[PDB]
RNA sequence: CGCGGGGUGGAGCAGCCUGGUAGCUCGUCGGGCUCAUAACCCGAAGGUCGUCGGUUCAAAUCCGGCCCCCGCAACCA
RNA sequence: AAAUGUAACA
RNA sequence: AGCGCCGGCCAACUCCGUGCCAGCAGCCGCGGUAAUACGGAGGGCGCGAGCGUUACCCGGAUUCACUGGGCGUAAAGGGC
RNA sequence: UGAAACUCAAAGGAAUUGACGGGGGCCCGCACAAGCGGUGGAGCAUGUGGUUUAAUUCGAAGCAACGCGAAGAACCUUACCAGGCCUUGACAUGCUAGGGAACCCGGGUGAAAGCCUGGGGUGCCCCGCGAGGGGAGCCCUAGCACAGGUGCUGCAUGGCCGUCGUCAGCUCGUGCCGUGAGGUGUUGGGUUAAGUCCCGCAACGAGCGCAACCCCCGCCGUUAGUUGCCAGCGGUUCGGCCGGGCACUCUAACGGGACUGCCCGCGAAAGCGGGAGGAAGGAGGGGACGACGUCUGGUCAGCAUGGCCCUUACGGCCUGGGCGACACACGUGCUACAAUGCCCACUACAAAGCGAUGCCACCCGGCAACGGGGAGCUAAUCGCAAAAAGGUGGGCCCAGUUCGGAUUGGGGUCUGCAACCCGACCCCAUGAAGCCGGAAUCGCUAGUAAUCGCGGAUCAGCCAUGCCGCGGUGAAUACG
């Protein structure tokens, strides 16, 4: 039963050899071997730190898969080794074997999902309807179903935030908080609109319909936007008022002024008497004012999120779910599913593993 | 879908059994299954003959079968060729004393499984379909049957578009019992799919 | 999963429990009637065409 | 800083003053009607009473301190 | 006295 | 010896690839796993040192009607 | 007075056929109403949605999916899952080469499959007193074609079925009307269960439907008399048992019988109302039978089939598990909530079916399930077999009970290689909900509903309270 667990080590590993390329990097490191091998090279060595950096970094790829080659064919040899001569300690020590390349393998998987900043954080998952109406918000309660039990066959937490049903039947949109381990790398392969061409049921003659819907997959920040006020920043005039007073206004500088520095943000006060009454209005609005700053960038990078974000219509989809024809199609890898009802089940290992290369 | 069979309709009535013998409780089930094989044999060494009716009568380990066709001595052979050496192959499956007759059929063109088959050859020919079932028709009532309809069911020419075509003359009471009318089918494979082929002669009503 | 199982519902197994009957004429192994050896839908079949001796439309 | 009014299910309000008992409407959930949805009909679930402490036998309720909310005032030079 | 049913009819 | 075309108009049909994608398009319309309509091929049709495309003019357009049109309800009787 | 940009491949007039209308007229169907019994509440059985799971295979989706395919899932079935295995293969047609054919019998390993292996004699037409030489009977081994797939598409199909709907309809030929789609006929008046029939009519005919021909039941006859029957006469062991007989009942083949045929009345007719005769009256009751077509209805998983896909595996064998899960939700049913009832004892009256490793009389052991004996019956003979409600007696006394029989403990029986998951039955003990059910909703017009039991198919056994049949008792109501 064991050279069955080597027949899947090198499964895993040749289309690992495939995006990473062993092919396109071994080339490349030869001449970054060649540059480095002249004397002068330590000449303006902000050169040649990104080099033998990037040589470990292409030696962590070339010659990783130099001893998965390698070492699975001594580990498949040494097992043979040892049932023709019924000798059980040269096959512990030839699975001592296969457990330690077991994890430079499992290492070299995480080129996959250890590359995207922040993998690891509790993501959610905003699913949207869209083109067709009452067909694609049931084809969009679908598809919340199809990632809920997704999300339960892999470790994560369920967590629904907020819902909001359709009118006729189904789902219009909602957002999920997968909390779990990793949950963003996985789920950020999931972004994109789902297209659902299918065999529509709420069109009277029972006629075939295409109806579109999105899932969209960020994860979570610290979302604390209450910057603290540093005086070191801070420049205060004060001055008289402008108006009413007597010998007062004149003759005392009771109006202040707190210009911040780096921002330019000016920001006055006259409405009391005291310059300390009007020191600390100012305080307040010189606060709240780069608090509308702060909110004016977040809001900023959303839009530029939602405008960068596709539009759930025609041709701009990366699935067929033809289930008059039984099929389950990732147009964008692209593989091709037949057991479709077991796609709606939870199997997105599938798409999702050969998605993150 | 809906009509009732137009012959099972009218066993002992106006049509008689093609296995006519009695059997007990222990027995049928393997003279039933003799009975089927001899008509698989028959029923595809005979179809170039011309084979409307397979007939079998059994009394204690003989049996007669009784073969009606178009063409006689296309099952004959040549002074009894064939005719030897399907009692050979016969006897070879029935273990027993397997007597075969032939007879006429009088008049093909009033034999409604006849009708059907040619029918079905000629679709198979890429032929007309709508031109073959009015010809059918036309050869039924000129050959003096008192009534006719053909039927053609499946991808017709080819198309897509599955489709029933269908003609008829004079009269075809199938709600009638005493009214005698034969029933046949036939089925034709083309490279697109298969039709099914029914014709109903009515012959003349008892 | 079938021409496998029209087969080796031939076979004389290992224990006479598991013995089943089949339809001799299409294999199916649900709603086959010991005198005939056939199911129901081939039972209807062949007494339509009228090759089951003596078997009639009942009416009453 | 002042005066005095509030915070009670998912939402909006009632309950306090004369303490023991938290109610109404909408919503939510299960069932019905309908081909289906809405509407309607039947049944159900649902509240640390902002917090800390504590009046009393006993606090949503009474009395202090803090925390957010609302209104008013902040004058004469 | 009582609302509505989109989007791919051979 | 090349160029256009081969769904109808409009002369010239099959195989494969694709699978509302890629693309075609003068009009009507083609393409959602058996497409004579997309792309290639075989074959075919039409011209030939040319063949197609774009632009523009007349024609078809009696669709500004002199030849040679209309106005109850199609556009069209003015309120008298 | 009066544009343009931009945009569309139409916007339009009239007329035709449908469909629809909270338009009308005239009709019909347990459609409503009139009734009677239920469902929805309870406990349980069963199917389904979900959810769970390694898998809880797959299909069915308003009526017309949901005790539906499933007329029998412990293994088998089985198509799913896990694990152990096989590679022209569980199976067809081949061609080639090695063994011996063929068939039976064991050994090892193993959960089994499988892998390994030790046994033993091949007819033929043949040179055969001789080694030896085959051919092809069939198997084995190695190949190459091929097999195999319940993998997809019922929106490529055949076949078969569901449905509107047993509704009264849908058409064609020729002629006539219209430029034409099309109309006419088929509409109209009357009538019928009916496009049934009558009358009228630019229509006159014809076909598919309706009806009839077919089956069961109701009366009677003829022919038959055992294994069925017994009116009368003999015996009568005390039982149609015996003689005897076929009358009667019956059984099962063939006929008769009802046609609005006959009288009254209304009618132009067709028919309608009433009466007699008759077992039966105006289709006598029930059945079989389902028009052109509709639902891109259902079924590629019964079968067949086009194409697409799998080929040491999307094929095949096996062992085990799952299809039997359970916070929930719906459909179909079973048993009930009691006195027109429950229990005990005794005692009557069916029909249709089934039955030779089958149905089992009778006897004995056991409280029993059952077991051990054992006769009969290829079954109008013998057996399943007792029908149950009912009847006659006795107990219960209005209570969660002598109602109800769920749940659980314990002890057994039988089938089966094997009842853990996951069988049915018996016995002791336990003895739940349920006091007649919200909104809503189903069936049935007469031997019907209600209620009572009996059989069968499937089937080793059975999760059947399901299905298909059979008879017993036997209502209420229909103004409209
Ligand atoms: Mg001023
Ligand atoms: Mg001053
Ligand atoms: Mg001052
Ligand atoms: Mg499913
Ligand atoms: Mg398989
Ligand atoms: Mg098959
Ligand atoms: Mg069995
Ligand atoms: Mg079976
Ligand atoms: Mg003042
Ligand atoms: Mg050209
Ligand atoms: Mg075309
Ligand atoms: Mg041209
Ligand atoms: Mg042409
Ligand atoms: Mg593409
Ligand atoms: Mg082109
Ligand atoms: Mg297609
Ligand atoms: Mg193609
Ligand atoms: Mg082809
Ligand atoms: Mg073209
Ligand atoms: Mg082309
Ligand atoms: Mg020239
Ligand atoms: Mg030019
Ligand atoms: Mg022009
Ligand atoms: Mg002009
Ligand atoms: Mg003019
Ligand atoms: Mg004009
Ligand atoms: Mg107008
Ligand atoms: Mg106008
Ligand atoms: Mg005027
Ligand atoms: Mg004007
Ligand atoms: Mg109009
Ligand atoms: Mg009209
Ligand atoms: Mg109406
Ligand atoms: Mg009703
Ligand atoms: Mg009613
Ligand atoms: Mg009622
Ligand atoms: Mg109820
Ligand atoms: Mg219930
Ligand atoms: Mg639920
Ligand atoms: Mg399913
Ligand atoms: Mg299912
Ligand atoms: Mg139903
Ligand atoms: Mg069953
Ligand atoms: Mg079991
Ligand atoms: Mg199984
Ligand atoms: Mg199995
Ligand atoms: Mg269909
Ligand atoms: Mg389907
Ligand atoms: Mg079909
Ligand atoms: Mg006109
Ligand atoms: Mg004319
Ligand atoms: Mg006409
Ligand atoms: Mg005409
Ligand atoms: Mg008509
Ligand atoms: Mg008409
Ligand atoms: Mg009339
Ligand atoms: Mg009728
Ligand atoms: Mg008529
Ligand atoms: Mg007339
Ligand atoms: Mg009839
Ligand atoms: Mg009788
Ligand atoms: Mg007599
Ligand atoms: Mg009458
Ligand atoms: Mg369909
Ligand atoms: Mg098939
Ligand atoms: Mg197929
Ligand atoms: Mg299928
Ligand atoms: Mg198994
Ligand atoms: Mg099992
Ligand atoms: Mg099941
Ligand atoms: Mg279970
Ligand atoms: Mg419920
Ligand atoms: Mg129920
Ligand atoms: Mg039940
Ligand atoms: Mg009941
Ligand atoms: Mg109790
Ligand atoms: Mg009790
Ligand atoms: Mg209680
Ligand atoms: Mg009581
Ligand atoms: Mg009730
Ligand atoms: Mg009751
Ligand atoms: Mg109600
Ligand atoms: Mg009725
Ligand atoms: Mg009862
Ligand atoms: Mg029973
Ligand atoms: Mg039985
Ligand atoms: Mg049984
Ligand atoms: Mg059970
Ligand atoms: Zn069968």
Same mark, same amino acid.
């Given at each position: ?7 899947? =080590? ?12 062993? #092919? ?56 043979? =080794? ?16 296969? %457990? ?80 779990? %381990? ?13 297209? =659902? ?25 610290? #979302? ?47 409405? %009391? ?37 596709? %539009? ?18 990732? =147009? ?26 | ?82 005719? !030897? ?69 499946? !991808? ?51 | ?24 004429? $299409? ?14 839908? $081939? ?18």
């Amino acid at each position: 039963p064991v050279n069955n667990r080597i027949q899947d =080590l090198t499964e895993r590993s040749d289309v690992l050899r495939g995006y990473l390329d062993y #092919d396109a990097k071994k080339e490349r490191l030869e001449e970054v071997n060649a540059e480095l091998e002249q004397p002068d090279v330590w000449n303006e060595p902000e050169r040649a730190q990104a080099l033998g950096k990037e040589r470990s970094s292409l030696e962590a790829v070339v010659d990783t898969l130099d001893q998965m080659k390698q070492g699975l064919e001594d580990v498949s040899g040494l097992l043979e =080794l040892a049932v023709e001569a019924d000798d059980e300690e040269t096959f512990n020590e030839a699975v001592a074997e296969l %457990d330690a390349l077991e994890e430079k393998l499992a290492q070299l998987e995480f080129r996959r999902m250890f590359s995207g900043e922040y993998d690891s954080a509790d993501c959610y998952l905003d699913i949207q309807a869209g083109s067709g109406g009452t067909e694609a918000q049931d084809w969009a309660s679908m598809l919340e179903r199809m990632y809920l039990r997704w999300a339960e066959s892999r470790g994560f937490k369920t967590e629904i935030i907020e819902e909001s049903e359709g009118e006729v039947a189904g789902i219009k949109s909602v957002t999920i908080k997968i909390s779990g %381990d990793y949950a963003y790398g996985w789920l950020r392969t999931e972004t994109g609109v789902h297209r =659902l061409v299918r065999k529509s049921p709420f069109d009277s003659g029972g006629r075939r319909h295409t109806s579109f819907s999105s899932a969209f997959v960020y994860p979570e920040v610290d #979302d604390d936007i209450d910057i603290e006020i540093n005086p070191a920043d801070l420049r205060i005039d004060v001055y008289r008022t402008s108006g009413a007073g007597g010998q007062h206004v004149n003759r005392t500088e009771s109006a202040v002024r707190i210009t911040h520095i780096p921002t330019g943000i000016v920001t006055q006060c006259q409405n %009391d008497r005291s310059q300390h009454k009007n020191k600390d209005q100012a305080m307040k609005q010189m606060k709240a004012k780069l608090y509308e700053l702060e909110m004016q960038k977040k809001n900023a990078e959303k839009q530029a999120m939602e405008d960068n974000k596709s %539009d759930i219509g025609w041709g701009s989809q990366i699935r067929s779910y033809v289930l008059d024809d039984s099929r389950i199609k990732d =147009l964008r890898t692209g593989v091709e599913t037949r057991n479709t009802q077991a796609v709606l089940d939870g199997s997105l290992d599938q798409f999702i593993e050969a998605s993150l290369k | 879908g809906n009509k009732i069979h137009p012959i099972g309709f009218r066993l002992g009535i106006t049509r008689d059994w093609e296995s006519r013998w009695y059997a007990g409780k222990k027995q049928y089930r393997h003279l039933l299954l003799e009975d089927q094989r001899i008509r698989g044999l028959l029923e595809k060494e005979l179809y170039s003959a011309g084979l409307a009716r397979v007939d079998i009568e059994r009394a204690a380990d003989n049996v007669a079968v009784t073969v009606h066709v178009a063409k006689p001595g296309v099952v004959i052979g040549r002074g009894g060729e064939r005719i !030897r050496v399907l009692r050979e192959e016969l006897a070879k499956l029935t273990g027993k004393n397997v007597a075969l007759n032939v007879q006429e059929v009088q008049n093909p063109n009033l034999s409604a499984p006849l009708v059907a088959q040619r029918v079905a050859e000629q679709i198979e020919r890429r032929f007309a379909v709508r031109r073959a079932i009015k010809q059918a028709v036309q050869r039924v009532m000129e050959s003096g049957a008192k009534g006719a309809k053909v039927i053609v069911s499946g !991808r017709i020419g080819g198309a897509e578009q599955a489709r029933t075509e269908w003609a008829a003359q004079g009269r075809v009471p199938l709600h009638t019992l005493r009214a005698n009318i034969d029933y046949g089918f036939a089925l034709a494979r083309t490279t697109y799919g298969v039709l099914g082929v029914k014709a109903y002669i009515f012959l003349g009503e008892v | 999963a079938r021409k496998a199982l029209i087969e080796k519902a031939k076979r004389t197994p290992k224990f006479k429990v598991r013995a089943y009957t089949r339809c001799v004429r $299409c294999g199916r192994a649900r709603s086959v009637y010991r005198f005939f050896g056939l199911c129901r839908i $081939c039972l209807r079949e062949l007494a339509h065409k009228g090759q089951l001796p003596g078997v009639r439309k009942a009416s009453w």
